[PDB]
Amino acid sequence: TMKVIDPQHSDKPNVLILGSGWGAISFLKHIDTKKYNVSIISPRSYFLFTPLLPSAPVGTVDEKSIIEPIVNFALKKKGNVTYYEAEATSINPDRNTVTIKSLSAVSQLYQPENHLGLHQAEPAEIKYDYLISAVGAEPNTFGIPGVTDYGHFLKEIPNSLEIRRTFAANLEKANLLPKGDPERRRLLSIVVVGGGPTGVEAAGELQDYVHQDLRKFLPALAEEVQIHLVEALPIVLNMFEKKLSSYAQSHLENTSIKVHLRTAVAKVEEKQLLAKTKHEDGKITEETIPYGTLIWATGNKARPVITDLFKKIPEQNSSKRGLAVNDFLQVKGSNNIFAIGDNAFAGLPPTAQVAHQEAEYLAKNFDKMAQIPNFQKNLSSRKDKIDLLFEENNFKPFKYNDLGALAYLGSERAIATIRSGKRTFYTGGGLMTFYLWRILYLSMILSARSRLKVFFDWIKLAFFKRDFFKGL
Amino acid sequence: TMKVIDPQHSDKPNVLILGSGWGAISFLKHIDTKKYNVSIISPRSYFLFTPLLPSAPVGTVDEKSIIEPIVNFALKKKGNVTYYEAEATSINPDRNTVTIKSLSAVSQLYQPENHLGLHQAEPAEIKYDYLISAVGAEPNTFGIPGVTDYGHFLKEIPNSLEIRRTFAANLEKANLLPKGDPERRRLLSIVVVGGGPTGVEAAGELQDYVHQDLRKFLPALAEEVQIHLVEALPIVLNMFEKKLSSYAQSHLENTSIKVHLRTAVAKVEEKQLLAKTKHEDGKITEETIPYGTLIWATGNKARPVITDLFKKIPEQNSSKRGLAVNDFLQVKGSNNIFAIGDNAFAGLPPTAQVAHQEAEYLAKNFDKMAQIPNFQKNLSSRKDKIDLLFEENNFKPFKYNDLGALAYLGSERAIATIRSGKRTFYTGGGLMTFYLWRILYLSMILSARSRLKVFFDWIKLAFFKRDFFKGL
Ligand SMILES: Cc1cc2nc3c(=O)[nH]c(=O)nc-3n(C[C@H](O)[C@H](O)[C@H](O)COP(=O)(O)OP(=O)(O)OC[C@H]3O[C@@H](n4cnc5c(N)ncnc54)[C@H](O)[C@@H]3O)c2cc1C
Ligand SMILES: Cc1cc2nc3c(=O)[nH]c(=O)nc-3n(C[C@H](O)[C@H](O)[C@H](O)COP(=O)(O)OP(=O)(O)OC[C@H]3O[C@@H](n4cnc5c(N)ncnc54)[C@H](O)[C@@H]3O)c2cc1C
Ligand SMILES: NC(=O)C1=CN([C@@H]2O[C@H](COP(=O)(O)OP(=O)(O)OC[C@H]3O[C@@H](n4cnc5c(N)ncnc54)[C@H](O)[C@@H]3O)[C@@H](O)[C@H]2O)C=CC1
Ligand SMILES: NC(=O)C1=CN([C@@H]2O[C@H](COP(=O)(O)OP(=O)(O)OC[C@H]3O[C@@H](n4cnc5c(N)ncnc54)[C@H](O)[C@@H]3O)[C@@H](O)[C@H]2O)C=CC1
Ligand SMILES: [Mg+2]
Ligand SMILES: [Mg+2]
Ligand SMILES: [Mg+2]
Ligand SMILES: [Mg+2]
Ligand SMILES: [Mg+2]
Ligand SMILES: [Mg+2]
Ligand SMILES: [Mg+2]
Ligand SMILES: [Mg+2]
Ligand SMILES: [Mg+2]
Ligand SMILES: [Mg+2]
Ligand SMILES: [Mg+2]
């Protein structure tokens, strides 16, 4: 009644990867396809270079520039790679299967090719020997009413399109109104919730667009726009040194952004929202803020496919943020499922930096398991022995190395702290820090094509105004 | 009951331009905004470099690369320019007004700025002293049933997006079917109707995508695609020398395109179409062709706003292709309306070449009228005297100079004939002709930005596969 895909052409173990983001793609880049048969399930046919997503809505870079098709990474592999463009809806640990839905395409990047007899929008289950879970996390509204109906997350490419569309629409409407109309002022106002680096960069890029481009042809309109950054803690960018946070805040304010600290959004309606400030003395004030565009850049929560898995594994029943993993990124209470990135919790921060390091670590471990015959044998064995097998063969546990953090602030200023272990190599803000920010992000891009395209976008930006088309 | 916009701040004449394509933008580039007050009505906020439109659906170039916002041309003008993003629905010659609808935005690129009190989706009429009509022409189905419902024109940016979407969707579906399934073969088949340069280049670019890119990751899928070029005349590209047409046809066939000459599409259904061949002996055969993607690249017809104007002007009642104009591009039976490009008929071909030459000619005439006080006086005068006034002051009539024609054929071959007057400088086909085709098109681009972007797209193409995203 339910189609099952179980490739037994080879005696290479079937490694199944969920997702096409930081964990999945970094893992894919390092996994040995000569030793393993690799399959990928993800509803998104491309990798997204998340740190430049805030630059996309106003066209500092193009949406296409920061994405790279999964297929292009896969063509570089020596062995067999299969990509299922579908969503994993259920992880079935006791039968070693993943259920998929919303199937759109299957791509078998090998020329023998076995017809699988799948049809679009028909469920199927995919058999694995090893599961690597990297489906990431979804934006968290914290139960605040209205944010889903009236705000825009900043998490995926379509969010960037939506934001451009809303804001460009607001600008056209607003410019038809007479100066000093409160409705005009509402349309020209943007609220960015979340004073983490995502919200800060979003606010900064928007301000860049308004000041550098919009101002060239509608200066009076540009003058009236008001961007708000709303943050619940007493400082923005709290992962940085306090003095860098103050530098950032003063800079943002200097570019005309209004920063609301100690402030939380309580309720969102279609044209206004309620913000409460909890002052240091303890008193609580409240302000209703009319807004044209709301961008919700706070926090992530676990995905339904992952929370369901919490129930199916006893050791995992007490999980909340993500799957709990051991020293070897093995999901607790499972001997063949691994979890990396934001869908896993190990006490580390939910960043690309961690996801990328975990992926590379895990792929190296898979190199070693391929030299030890017993691993692939415990697959068929009755006993979950893979936990023991890591300590037995003295695999080192995963150790995260924090390399620091960066944040663009708009108007050619950035802050940065670069490190390794206990050594700090760079830490500060300014004009040169901005150039460093560019060179560094360019270096972290996972593909030559995307790297060139971003580079071409920045060159073009030196001579011309950003592309800000309503429907492109 | 109907708002009327009549700027009388200055004693500069109000020149009103309809459209934002080849005629409108070329004219705008050359019109003297120190002598004239310039306004523009067009539903499309940008100029479209039409000759590269066939390269967009498969990402040989990107859609953004071949467009340039009207506003960027306008910023370069010294005087006052206003852009109404709306559709001209009625030209009202006796009151010197144009009715607009579907208003989205108004942009006054000048600092004084008078609030006009317009609202979105409220009709208005725009007063002019001089009207320049350049709304172009729309695609012509020839009454063939089904082409509107089931095909895609190749006329505007959204057509390019639609075609990519259809064909990318068909490829995913087809690759899920087993080899030799007729439904798979149907999904992999494309029909391009029209053997003019538009249809040829569309066919050529698609074949390029299939052979150079698709083949790299789904070679068997690439092998099964079949592109058809359907043309009713006995030769393709009939504006060229017969020998260049034969070269082109053999080339297309050599790249695996199937060329159907003396063949017309009689009827289009959702999954097949009826094609009839009228052989040279006189006999008529018919073939039903299953297709996944239909591209309709034949012919244009006059727009409704233009046909309505036919009825309102006596001298224009017998018009069919477009507005009839005199030696000075003045609309016959009107003393203040001019028509250039495809909305005008003067016995010249409907090309960008003609539209661009007319525009530049007309803007130079407007330079001369600005030295002769009587022109701007006949505006207020009771008598239509502007017709006489051109012969009187010995303005030379517009003379078109054919510079030739180019066509890309796919697989790095093109044909080209370059001329001026009776002299031919170049005429032939081949690899070098392709490089010439690139250098020449780059030269005809109207903006530095668009020119750089196209150039970057071609560079990227030298190293990487085309971007072919379903939803970007
Ligand atoms: C705008 C923005 C900027 C950021 N900037 C930085 C930065 O500068 N530095 C930094 O360290 N971190 C940054 N991050 C955070 C970083 O992107 C994440 O920590 C990282 O993406 C986590 O990697 P992941 O693979 O776990 O999830 P992701 O990278 O998000 O990838 C998850 C993938 O799984 C796929 N998927 C989703 N649901 C399913 C399903 N049901 N089945 C199968 N597949 C599924 C998705 O399509 C996605 O491709 C940023 C995040 C955002 C939103
Ligand atoms: C795919 C393609 C490729 C081509 N390649 C070539 C080539 O290589 N060489 C060549 O010489 N010619 C070429 N042409 C022909 C050339 O593009 C046209 O002749 C060109 O458009 C000149 O016509 P125009 O400027 O009058 O109108 P267009 O350039 O078509 O533009 C007319 C403008 O009027 C606007 N408009 C439409 N309706 C209304 C309304 N109701 N009110 C107000 N404004 C309106 C439109 O938005 C548009 O911006 C090509 C055409 C196509 C479709
Ligand atoms: N350039 C860089 O180095 C970047 C790094 N990152 C990392 O990616 C991860 C993703 O996190 P982010 O999206 O940036 O979120 P974040 O969690 O770092 O910040 C969200 C912020 O919004 C605030 N907030 C929560 N609820 C609120 C409410 N109801 N009303 C008002 N404010 C509220 C919180 O105090 C919080 O600090 C982070 O861990 C971050 O460190 C993200 C972007 C850029
Ligand atoms: N690179 C270049 O020089 C380019 C120039 N152009 C211009 O675009 C303009 C469009 O002019 P058109 O009059 O439309 O010529 P067209 O050449 O686009 O004509 C379309 C062709 O399809 C044929 N056809 C018509 N009905 C058919 C049917 N029902 N079934 C099958 N075939 C059918 C016609 O005979 C005709 O040859 C041309 O003047 C052309 O020069 C367009 C693209 C490129
Ligand atoms: Mg196997
Ligand atoms: Mg991932
Ligand atoms: Mg990602
Ligand atoms: Mg995530
Ligand atoms: Mg994850
Ligand atoms: Mg025009
Ligand atoms: Mg055009
Ligand atoms: Mg100016
Ligand atoms: Mg036209
Ligand atoms: Mg016209
Ligand atoms: Mg179809």
UniProtKB/Swiss-Prot annotation, chains A, B:
Subcellular location: Mitochondrion inner membrane
GO cellular component, one term: mitochondrial matrix
Main location: mitochondrion
Amino acids binding NAD(+): 188-224
Protein's membrane topology: Peripheral membrane protein
Family annotation (Pfam families): NDH2_C (PF22366), Pyr_redox_2 (PF07992)
Keyword annotations: FAD, Flavoprotein, Membrane, Mitochondrion, Mitochondrion inner membrane, NAD, Oxidoreductase, Transit peptide, Ubiquinone
Cofactor note text: Binds 1 FAD per subunit.
EC numbers: 1.6.5.9
Biological processes, Gene Ontology terms: mitochondrial electron transport, NADH to ubiquinone; positive regulation of apoptotic process
InterPro entries: FAD/NAD-bd_sf, FAD/NAD-binding_dom, NDH-2, NDH2-like_C
Swiss-Prot/TrEMBL catalytic activity: a quinone + NADH + H(+) = a quinol + NAD(+); a ubiquinone + NADH + H(+) = a ubiquinol + NAD(+)
GO molecular function: identical protein binding; NADH dehydrogenase (ubiquinone) activity; NADH:ubiquinone reductase (non-electrogenic) activity; oxidoreductase activity
Gene3D superfamilies attached to this UniProt entry: 3.50.50.100
Binding, FAD: 14-44
SUPFAM superfamilies: FAD/NAD(P)-binding domain (SSF51905)
Cofactor: FAD
Role noted for this protein: Catalyzes the oxidation of NADH generated inside the Mitochondrion.
Family: Belongs to the NADH dehydrogenase family.
UniProt miscellaneous comment: Present with 5240 molecules/cell in log phase SD medium.
Name of the protein in question: Rotenone-insensitive NADH-ubiquinone oxidoreductase, mitochondrial
Species assigned in the record: Saccharomyces cerevisiae (strain ATCC 204508 / S288c)
Originating gene: NDI1
